[PDB]
Design a protein around this ligand. Structure first.
Ligand SMILES: C=CC[N@@+]1(C)CC[C@]23c4c5ccc(O)c4O[C@H]2C(=O)CC[C@@]3(O)[C@H]1C5
Ligand SMILES: C=CC[N@@+]1(C)CC[C@]23c4c5ccc(O)c4O[C@H]2C(=O)CC[C@@]3(O)[C@H]1C5
Ligand SMILES: C=CC[N@@+]1(C)CC[C@]23c4c5ccc(O)c4O[C@H]2C(=O)CC[C@@]3(O)[C@H]1C5
Ligand SMILES: CC(=O)N[C@@H]1[C@@H](O)[C@H](O)[C@@H](CO)O[C@H]1O
Ligand SMILES: CC(=O)N[C@@H]1[C@@H](O)[C@H](O)[C@@H](CO)O[C@H]1O
Ligand SMILES: CC(=O)N[C@@H]1[C@@H](O)[C@H](O)[C@@H](CO)O[C@H]1O
Ligand SMILES: CC(=O)N[C@@H]1[C@@H](O)[C@H](O)[C@@H](CO)O[C@H]1O
Lengths: 531, 532, 531
């Protein structure tokens, strides 16, 4: 009969689902609430504990996904989902739910490691349900937990002061971790060993939680898949007031004072705010006006509660969580996904340095490279061959290095120097679950490490023997690290700790170790921005 | 040295004299004259009506609003097409049926110059008349240039497929405007016996429509369709339209009980509301999710029974159109950079392999209308010859272009020809200096690249070579001559062969010389493939 | 480098403004929150502590003024302002701020006397920003604090029971005094010597705080200028339910229960409420209807928290916590300003016994004189002369005595008989800063003392030496009082204590003691009022 777990707030009811090659069925709990629904007055304020219930809560229905662009959410979800068919989602502000996938034997009393996944999506789109944690849970025998946090205006609108500090979405993730620290045992998970991991916005968040005091003791290992707290685009530095006003005004609200804007914004309907989010055209590159005045998304800010100062200023202080940290990236972070999902101006694969300098400028909101520095940057990259077909491919590398590549290593380095176990990797593979509209040449595009990490090859039909092999290995590494803080294991290519040798593991069809990841680009960029 | 005041049928109007360099005869210009009663409230979704006459002197010295459309989407298109040194930022309004007039005629003496009436493009979803300044062309060719606006998007094209909201509103505004010119143009020095309508893309398809419309009879005399015709698969919606109307009704939060109900409901929605519905529909962008066949990129022309009595195909199939000089033309790379860029096309890698090729061609159903089974065969008839990754991408755009504009144009042209009416074709191949910076030097003859010549931008915008300047001068001369004799050929100009049985046309560009059989082989393959 | 102070709730960044003849520049702090913005839920409820902030609250721009009729607000700020230029302001419900002008050297420890100013405006309009405390703070070297409090419907609506007690404005004022107790120390001010002062409705408020247990230890010196707790127009005795019903009906609300009205009004927008204020056409003499019903102001009430009994009853009981109270009036309280701004039907400058009687009756809301007694009052005042000119002057004297004259003196005497130090004055002077439309014949009009108390001669242009002297003297008198409970000091004419001799100071061109101020008046009115 159905699994029933007794949590602090009440009894939850799930469902048993076994996986091929596994006698033990995983116990799936869909839609467990960890916070009071963030409605009306609770909008733009930290999350509050959830109220308890009297009987047995039926946790077997996919919770709604946090309000967001309905078409963006769906497209993105179809792309990264590791399921056979993408599960259609309903929008709601009442979306602080998390899903539990546990292989543990609920009759006895186990303590399996807990891996908490924070989806990516730009703090704008994304859903937890997009990722099914059956395969990973079954194969590596760990308790997977997919959590949701507030997105867009709802989760990151800030006035720069006490009237609306911001990072509501992040305080949610903290609340989520805190909920796991209190109830996970009930599901066979060991609260003493929680690993947080995510990609893109998820990775950036993981990185932010390593830096925040509100997160200490809530996790013991961290993995950052293609995204950190130095990916400038997601982190809002300097005065944010203008952006709050731009939104307030668009939502049709006065801007007399901070208290007034936030008060007028809580009055808007979910529908209303969505229409503003739509008018704002986030997650899309503006081709008119000054790129500096453009703002693709509402992200993390230095509220003074979660983050007490710029990540950069923090790392320098060596003041943060010195827990095992695994940072990684993919060979072509700007391969096709991001650009295709941001309406990037690129059709002809022919790209001249002139036209190249123009986009690099229009890309300001992504790369943030002062105009008078564009020529030196474009040169160091496209100055190679006179091949206009090779320049655009190199141009794409330029973006990737700035947005993800360089930031990652810098984080990796400082964490390293902070006296803690560090790990790095470079994912270079091309899954057959990639969209048809994706060129066969793009290998290691954004989010390609997801299918391996989440055992897509056991949930989807059609994988190759190679892919299947890759996934197992990747899931193996991730799990080991989840319990030891060291990915190394038997029958797995040795993964070098990231020390002064700067050794990482090149994960791909062929997975060997290497050294000096992006050594030159780091130096090159660290210099130019220091100009 | 006092301002030019002209008396129209509905009252006096007051413009301003402006002179272009090198021209002694100044140009009298009028901005925002109303050619119809503002289509507000009850007038939404209904034929345009005569403007209300005024008592004193109307100030026609300021630019008029552009019809409600995607603000960001319209301004963007206006910066990329404007022939002015600095783009004019415009305001949105349902009260948008105005027209700007530029006449080099000496208002004191009784003049009767040819009248060229423009019709802006923009997928019948965006665009404004104030973007195409008409000074240069008037001054340089002594022709009265009129630029007109017309209801766009929902406002100008919503249809329930029956009487309650036939459709074509915008096209009727266009007629209304032509009607206006007839009754008032003489006051501005024009000759209502020589009206040439011309437009680019949506503007061009509109011209080919009017040429096919009875309600346009006796309203224009020469016609020029620049890269867009009545057969451009994507602007003319054949089949049951009811589904679209309902999807739209439903988005604006309206019932679908009856056509009557939907229409009435929508009529009470505020301008803002419809604008939010337009955004939500996310028009003029390629839908990569769902079923490509259900995708609907833009509301367009429909067979209503008032403007169009049968399908464009049927009308030109019989001799049910007007035998007036018609100049049809296309650009070298219609699907070069502009359109794709502006529809969010996925091409980051800039190179495609057969597979991904047939794939995307499918998502492109609304733009090319090719069944899933035909996709493979067509993709090979284009991307097979070579096994080069980027050459396929290039050859892949040709595909779309030939289907969208190339083929249609020739067919529209051949028919007119076979109708006994004088026809003329051309192919613009040239990369203007005023091209978007984000545009690769590799794109030549992209969509609307010919607009900079036609309107003589090299005389308003700065930084142009002797080449460009000479090209604009040649184009304008060709157009104007056409608008004067219905024959572009004139003194000191390459010979432009008439598009008769030998299929001669003009390849315009740095090197401008005649050629024959334009897209003859493309016409064959497609005419063939769409025949199952 | 601008001055930065740490208050209990966070760092504030102000600005240094030097004044002529004085070294130590003044530290000016504008728009400091002393309470959580009374919005939504909080509308019509006690004022609340503000939320602490995280970095440095930059306070170098004037706060909004509590929603009120814009026109009335601005015209008044114009006439009462002591600044070279009148600063236009923004209306907002988010208005609970206060400005500070500290001449202390924040780098060293200081304990200078604190003078809290409560602006007048009939409790319907007014703003703290109107009064620049530069001159006073520097010349007398005291810390001037200008506070704001809710106005009109927002600050004084009540149903005469628990659902909306009323007196929200005064609670805001007491709230500001509490802030000053816990913060001014950080601004060189002594929280053990806080003096409150205000004129008109402000003087009445100070007069109310003086009588309320809620303020017991928030001030140690009080000063009422033209307005006291007995100025009947500003206090609502009896059943207030009819005015709350009228307001609700006009606001478009039902009148089913006290709880219902409150709730419905609490759901209307800021604008919908402002419009109600406008439709009620407050602060204007109601020429139509029964005088007795017209409500020109929405004022103080016997809520039960702030005021436990009527002002009159509270003066009887001789409480054990007392302070030095200064009470003063001007020579022509109802001279020009007030009736000019209330659209008084006194336009032919003349007046006969019959027309006076008619005018007095309509004045019921201001003088509260029964119809049966009008003749006695009217004859007792205009029966002296024979010409309609002097008769009119005497009519403006009747009103003035009923409104401030007698009430004031009754308040002073009771304070005296209670055992605390009392002082009075009658200001007689026509400041050069008067309004062009004010005829030169009016001397000691309402509010004319303001320019002397705030040193307009040191901020505004063209003051004669005599005016400049009068200001220096007034300020010193006010300061000596602020730090002694006695205004006397070296270089100043003598001010006698207001004891059984009823000695008071006559301030003006020529300043000197006198006795029995308004003595006979207080007599004629006390008796007649008991008929
Ligand atoms: C599914 C959405 C498309 N997709 C475009 C590309 C790359 C990335 C991104 C977006 C918008 C602006 C960016 O700068 C940016 O960088 C990435 C990131 O870190 C998280 C969010 C995001 O995954 C998302 C939108
Ligand atoms: C944001 C860009 C503007 N946006 C949408 C307007 C209408 C349309 C268009 C453009 C430029 C020139 C046109 O003639 C034209 O018609 C439309 C079409 O068919 C495809 C491309 C396009 O969707 C795009 C740019
Ligand atoms: C339109 C409002 C009427 N208007 C101007 C009359 C005179 C005065 C006043 C009021 C109410 C009660 C008074 O005692 C009183 O005196 C004046 C003052 O000092 C400030 C406020 C005020 O300007 C206001 C209301
Ligand atoms: C708590 C509750 O709602 N009860 C439901 C029950 O009706 C349903 O049969 C079962 C499976 O669907 O899940 C549970
Ligand atoms: C009523 C109106 O539109 N105002 C116009 C003004 O904009 C213009 O500048 C002026 C002269 O051109 O004539 C008038
Ligand atoms: C009074 C005024 O605003 N001046 C403008 C003038 O600058 C402008 O050139 C003219 C035509 O647009 O309209 C008017
Ligand atoms: C560092 C900073 O933001 N300085 C601002 C200043 O520019 C502004 O004039 C003032 C009032 O708005 O507040 C402060």
């Amino acid at each position: 009969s159905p699994p029933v777990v007794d949590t602090v707030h009440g009894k939850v009811l799930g469902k048993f689902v076994s996986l091929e090659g596994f006698a033990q069925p995983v116990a799936i709990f869909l839609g467990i609430p960890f916070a009071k629904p963030p409605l009306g007055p609770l909008r733009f304020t930290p999350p509050q504990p959830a109220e308890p219930w009297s009987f047995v809560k039926n946790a077997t229905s996919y919770p709604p996904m946090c309000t967001q662009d309905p078409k963006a959410g769906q497209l993105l979800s179809e792309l990264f989902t590791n399921r056979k068919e993408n599960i259609p989602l309903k929008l709601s502000e009442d979306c602080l739910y998390l899903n539990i996938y546990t292989p543990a034997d609920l009759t006895k009393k186990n303590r399996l490691p807990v891996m908490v996944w924070i989806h990516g999506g730009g703090l704008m789109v994304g859903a937890a349900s997009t990722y099914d944690g059956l395969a990973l849970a079954a194969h590596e025998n760990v308790v997977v937990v997919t959590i949701q946090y507030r997105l867009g205006i709802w989760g990151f609108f800030s006035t720069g002061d006490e009237h609306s500090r911001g990072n509501w979405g992040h305080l949610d993730q903290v609340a989520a971790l805190r909920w796991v620290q209190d109830n996970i045992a009930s599901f066979g998970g060991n609260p003493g060993s929680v690993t947080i991991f995510g990609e893109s916005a998820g990775g950036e968040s993981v990185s932010v939680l390593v830096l925040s005091p509100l997160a200490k003791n809530l996790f013991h290992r961290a993995i950052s898949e293609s995204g950190v707290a130095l990916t400038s685009v997601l982190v809002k530095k300097g005065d944010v007031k203008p952006l709050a006003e731009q939104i307030a005004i668009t939502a049709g609200c006065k801007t007399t004072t901070s208290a007034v804007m936030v008060h007028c914004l809580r009055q808007k309907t979910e529908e209303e705010l969505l229409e503003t989010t739509l008018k704002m055209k986030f997650l899309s590159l503006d081709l008119q006006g000054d790129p500096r005045e453009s703002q693709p998304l509402l992200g993390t800010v230095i509220d003074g509660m979660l983050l007490l100062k710029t990540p950069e200023e923090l790392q320098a202080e060596r003041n943060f969580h010195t827990v095992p940290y695994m940072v990684g990236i993919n060979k072509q972070e700007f391969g096709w996904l991001i650009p295709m999902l941001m309406s990037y101006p690129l059709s002809e694969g022919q790209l001249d340095q002139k036209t190249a300098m123009s986009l690099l400028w229009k890309s300001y909101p992504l790369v943030c490279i002062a105009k008078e520095l564009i020529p030196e940057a474009t040169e160091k990259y496209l100055g190679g061959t006179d091949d206009t077909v090779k320049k655009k491919d190199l141009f794409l590398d330029l973006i990737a290095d700035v947005m993800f590549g360089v930031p990652s290593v810098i984080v990796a380095r400082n964490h390293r120097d902070a006296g803690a176990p560090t790990y790095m990797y470079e994912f270079q593979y091309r899954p057959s679950f990639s969209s048809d509209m994706k060129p066969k040449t793009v290998i290691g595009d954004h989010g390609d490490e997801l299918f391996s990490v989440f055992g897509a090859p056991f949930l989807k039909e059609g994988a190759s023997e190679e892919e299947i092999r890759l996934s197992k290995m990747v899931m193996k590494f991730w799990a080991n690290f989840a319990r030891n803080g060291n990915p190394n294991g038997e029958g797995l290519p040795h993964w070098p700790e990231y020390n002064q040798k700067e050794g990482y593991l090149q994960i791909g069809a062929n997975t060997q170790a290497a050294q000096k990841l992006k050594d030159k680009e780091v130096a090159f960029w660290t210099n130019l921005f220091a100009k």
